[PDB]
Amino acid sequence: QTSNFRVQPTESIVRFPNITNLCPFGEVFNATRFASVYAWNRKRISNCVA
């Protein structure tokens, strides 16, 4: 009974979920109006792929 001693090249593959939730950067860049510098608008982004 003989050990392997048989070299075979190997490839590499990565696999992930598609996107399924895009961070809404459209809502903060392509908007209609922004606040004044003294009353700067703020938004929180979390739980999304940026």
Partner: protein
């Protein structure tokens, strides 16, 4: 000094209509472009309506849509406007001001400069409930 006294505020029933005024003194009416604002208690100042110095644009804000009639009288140098179909969202403090003087700051120059003229600010409440 230049003054802009605001008046005409009060609690009004929703769906009604009221009016308020701004008496301006210390400058000629035609020099400056005049207008009003609105201050929600928890949000910053917003522009609602404004009158051209001559009366060319007299532009408004689509937030109030077509529920406006602004009118400035030169003899008294006084600005007027009214609300129709009152709704609670209109509840806010409305101020009066005149433009024309804006700061001129050159690249890395001097930020100190002339500024516009503001008013006093009168509160307007819209609600379907009565008052004691």
């Amino acid at each position: 000094a230049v003054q802009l006294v605001d008046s005409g505020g009060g609690s009004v029933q929703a769906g009604g209509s009221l009016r308020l005024s701004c008496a301006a003194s210390g400058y000629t009416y035609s020099i400056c472009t005049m207008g009003w604002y609105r201050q929600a208690p928890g949000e910053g100042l917003e522009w609602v309506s404004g009158i051209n110095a001559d009366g060319s644009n007299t532009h408004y804000t689509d937030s109030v849509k077509g529920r406006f009639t602004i009118s400035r009288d030169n003899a008294k140098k006084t600005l007027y406007l009214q609300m129709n179909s009152l709704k609670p969202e209109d509840t806010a403090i409305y101020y009066c001001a005149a433009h024309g003087t804006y700061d001129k700051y050159a690249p890395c120059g001097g930020f100190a400069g002339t500024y516009t003229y503001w008013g006093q600010g009168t509160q307007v409440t819209v609600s379907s409930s009565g008052q004691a």
